[PDB]
Amino acid sequence: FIKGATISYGKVKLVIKHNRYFVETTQADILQMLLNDSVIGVHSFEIANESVEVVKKRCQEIDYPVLEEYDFRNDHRNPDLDIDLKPSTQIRPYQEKSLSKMFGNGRARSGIIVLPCGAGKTLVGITAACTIKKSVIVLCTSSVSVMQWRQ
Amino acid sequence: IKPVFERFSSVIITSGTISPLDMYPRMLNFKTVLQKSYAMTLAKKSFLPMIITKGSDQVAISSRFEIRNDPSIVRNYGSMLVEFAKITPDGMVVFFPSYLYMESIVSMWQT
Amino acid sequence: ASLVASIVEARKKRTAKKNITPYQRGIIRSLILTLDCSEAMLEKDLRPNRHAMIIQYAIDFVHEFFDQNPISQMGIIIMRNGLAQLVSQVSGNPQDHIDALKSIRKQEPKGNPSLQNALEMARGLLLPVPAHCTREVLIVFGSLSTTDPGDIHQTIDSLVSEKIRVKVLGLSAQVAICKELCKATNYGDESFYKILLDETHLKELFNEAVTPLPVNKINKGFTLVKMGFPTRIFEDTPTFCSCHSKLVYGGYFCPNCHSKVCSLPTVCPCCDLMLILSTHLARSYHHLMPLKTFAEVPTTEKFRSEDCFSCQSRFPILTSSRYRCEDCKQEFCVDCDVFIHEILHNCPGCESKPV
Numbered sequence: 001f002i003k004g005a006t007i008s009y010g011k012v013k014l015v016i017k018h019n020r021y022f023v024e025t026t027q028a029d030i031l032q033m034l035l036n037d038s039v040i041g042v043h044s045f046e047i048a049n050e051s052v053e054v055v056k057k058r059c060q061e062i063d064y065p066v067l068e069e070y071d072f073r074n075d076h077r078n079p080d081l082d083i084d085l086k087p088s089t090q091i092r093p094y095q096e097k098s099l100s101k102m103f104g105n106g107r108a109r110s111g112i113i114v115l116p117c118g119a120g121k122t123l124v125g126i127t128a129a130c131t132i133k134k135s136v137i138v139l140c141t142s143s144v145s146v147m148q149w150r151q
Numbered sequence: 152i153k154p155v156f157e158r159f160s161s162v163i164i165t166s167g168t169i170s171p172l173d174m175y176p177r178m179l180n181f182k183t184v185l186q187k188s189y190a191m192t193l194a195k196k197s198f199l200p201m202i203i204t205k206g207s208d209q210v211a212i213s214s215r216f217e218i219r220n221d222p223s224i225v226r227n228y229g230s231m232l233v234e235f236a237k238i239t240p241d242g243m244v245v246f247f248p249s250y251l252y253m254e255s256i257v258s259m260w261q262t
Numbered sequence: 263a264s265l266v267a268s269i270v271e272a273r274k275k276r277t278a279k280k281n282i283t284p285y286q287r288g289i290i291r292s293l294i295l296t297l298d299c300s301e302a303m304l305e306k307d308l309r310p311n312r313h314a315m316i317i318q319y320a321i322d323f324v325h326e327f328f329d330q331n332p333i334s335q336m337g338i339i340i341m342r343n344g345l346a347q348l349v350s351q352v353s354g355n356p357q358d359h360i361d362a363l364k365s366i367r368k369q370e371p372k373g374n375p376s377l378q379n380a381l382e383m384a385r386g387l388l389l390p391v392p393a394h395c396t397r398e399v400l401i402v403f404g405s406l407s408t409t410d411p412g413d414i415h416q417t418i419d420s421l422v423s424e425k426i427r428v429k430v431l432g433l434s435a436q437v438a439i440c441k442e443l444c445k446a447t448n449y450g451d452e453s454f455y456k457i458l459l460d461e462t463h464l465k466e467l468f469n470e471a472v473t474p475l476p477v478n479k480i481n482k483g484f485t486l487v488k489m490g491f492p493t494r495i496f497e498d499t500p501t502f503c504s505c506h507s508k509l510v511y512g513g514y515f516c517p518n519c520h521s522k523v524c525s526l527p528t529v530c531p532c533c534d535l536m537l538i539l540s541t542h543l544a545r546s547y548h549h550l551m552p553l554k555t556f557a558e559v560p561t562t563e564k565f566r567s568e569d570c571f572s573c574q575s576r577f578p579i580l581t582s583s584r585y586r587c588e589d590c591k592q593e594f595c596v597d598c599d600v601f602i603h604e605i606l607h608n609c610p611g612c613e614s615k616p617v
């Protein structure tokens with residue numbers, strides 16, 4: 001079961017450039033696997049913004065689970081934001097562990113972090129935004145919660 | 152150094168941290184009969200060389216002069232300094248790339 | 263090879279125990295136990311913490327120390343807030359020291375340590391010690407730094423002048439001053455500075471210190487000490503003791519002034535004459551005539567009996583599971599060899615062999 005659930009990770013990567021999503025790949029061989037795919041339609045091809053949810057789900061079934069990594073260190077096109085955690089902060093151990101699983105390899109991993117209620121998930125997001133140093137957007141399921149983010 | 156290698160026949164150029172050994176004949180125009188480096192036959196490892204590429208927060212650290220006044224690099228280096236000063240028994244020497252870098256970073260540490 | 267690996271490890275361990283020469287050891291000792299109670303002892307490397315484990319082993323060390331060295335004295339010092347605090351005077355009563363250690367178990371350690379202050383206090387407590395006793399200090403250091411008000415080098419020289427001996431048990435790593443303190447004080451030997459690598463090693467280190475320290479050849483303090491052997495009495499009515507001035511049903515009677523004492527071995531509170539029993543001296547005979555180590559018998563030669571000479575255990579049928587004593591030439595089982603050299607101190611074959 002574990003061997004069967006094995007993937008060729010990193011072959012396909014989705015990138016964003018000027019609000020245009022390109023499904024770029026690190027080898028040409030993948031083209032024969034994607035361009036000939038029934039659902040779809042150093043090499044990349046265009047895809048509609050709204051249709052991303054189709055290719056990603058299809059990518060789950062054709063044995064290539066795409067990864068959404070960001071090289072914020074090497075990204076200069078986007079205007080950088082200079083925000084850092086002030087010295088008064090004290091990141092708790094589990095918060096550091098949660099962030100390490102995201103920035104372990106140096107590239108911002110896209111995923112989900114689960115912590116108990118009141119564990120400080122807001123500070124985890126703040127630290128992730130502070131270290132990325134780029135424009136950030138936050139979505140919360142209330143207006144009261146939106147205000148407490150700002151505070 | 153041209154006169155030295157011509158006035159004297161036998162010259163020994165010995166140093167415990169001379170590497171690569173082929174760049175000196177290129178830099179200084181002289182030829183060597185033999186050049187080699189010895190590996191110490193030590194029973195148990197006596198020195199533990201290590202390279203630290205990031206701090207406890209997994210943020211990279213570098214001594215680039217353009218970001219010397221950075222709250223992240225300064226803090227990460229300072230934390231490393233304190234942590235290694237808590238387990239080092241007797242002596243701990245710290246080497247900086249330039250004197251100005253030491254002054255700026257030390258002042259930030261004090262604040 | 264797994265079983266062979268254990269045997270060769272046992273042989274290597276036996277190698278250190280093969281060279282047992284009758285070294286002159288000072289049975290009469292005067293020990294000062296310097297424990298560290300500082301911020302550095304609040305770490306969690308030793309569960310639950312360094313302070314708790316050290317005190318617990320110290321109590322066990324106190325019990326073992328007096329059991330094997332009944333005519334010795336001990337004192338306890340603690341390093342707190344950069345100062346040396348005395349918690350027990352030099353005395354032969356094992357209960358007083360244990361009581362002091364239990365009280366210390368409550369107070370939290372804090373502050374910085376000071377070897378000089380502890381050593382200076384030790385120099386004073388050991389000053390009123392006879393010349394026939396070995397003045398020793400067993401420091402349990404846990405910090406990697408020492409804050410002192412004066413020159414530690416001067417104190418180290420003073421300790422050497424007074425013929426004091428120092429054993430240091432560190433926790434984290436080597437410290438230069440501790441190495442010099444142990445080296446310049448032990449006649450150049452560098453085996454008196456021990457750093458534990460786990461909890462199990464710590465128990466062995468305390469247990470090792472219980473044995474008397476062999477004396478140097480150029481350090482001669484030979485003399486005769488006036489001792490006394492009292493006779494226990496059974497009185498119907500309670501009587502006042504000459505040591506604690508309380509009512510005790512029994513007690514020993516001194517042979518020099520007839521004043522009674524409660525427990526032994528203690529110096530008489532009237533004539534200042536040491537009172538001991540024949541058993542107290544017999545406990546240390548094995549330190550003067552150590553039993554010669556047993557040598558594994560090769561399987562090439564033939565054996566005498568199929569069972570152990572002492573315990574009558576069938577020898578398990580490569581390697582010969584027999585240990586022989588050269589003095590009597592009698593085979594022994596592996597189990598007996600451990601019990602004959604650790605609990606017992608006489609070879610049953612030698613005693614059984616007539617002469």
Ligand SMILES: Nc1ncnc2c1ncn2[C@@H]1O[C@H](COP(=O)(O)OP(=O)(O)O)[C@@H](O)[C@H]1O
Pocket residue numbers: 090091092115116117118119120121122123
């Ligand atoms: N590192 C921290 N230092 C101080 N307070 C913290 C820290 N982490 C979390 N908190 C506090 O925990 C509470 C809940 O934080 P919040 O991020 O809203 O939790 P969650 O979103 O996980 O339910 C707040 O009072 C917040 O200030």
Ligand code: BEF
Pocket residue numbers: 116117118119121
């Ligand atoms: F998980 Be929390 F209560 F937002």
Ligand SMILES: [Zn+2]
Pocket residue numbers: 503504505506507508510523524
């Ligand atoms: Zn009494």
Ligand SMILES: [Zn+2]
Pocket residue numbers: 516517518519520521530531532533534535
């Ligand atoms: Zn008396």
Ligand SMILES: [Zn+2]
Pocket residue numbers: 570571572573574575594595596597598599
């Ligand atoms: Zn036996």
Ligand SMILES: [Zn+2]
Pocket residue numbers: 587588589590591592609610611612
């Ligand atoms: Zn024998």
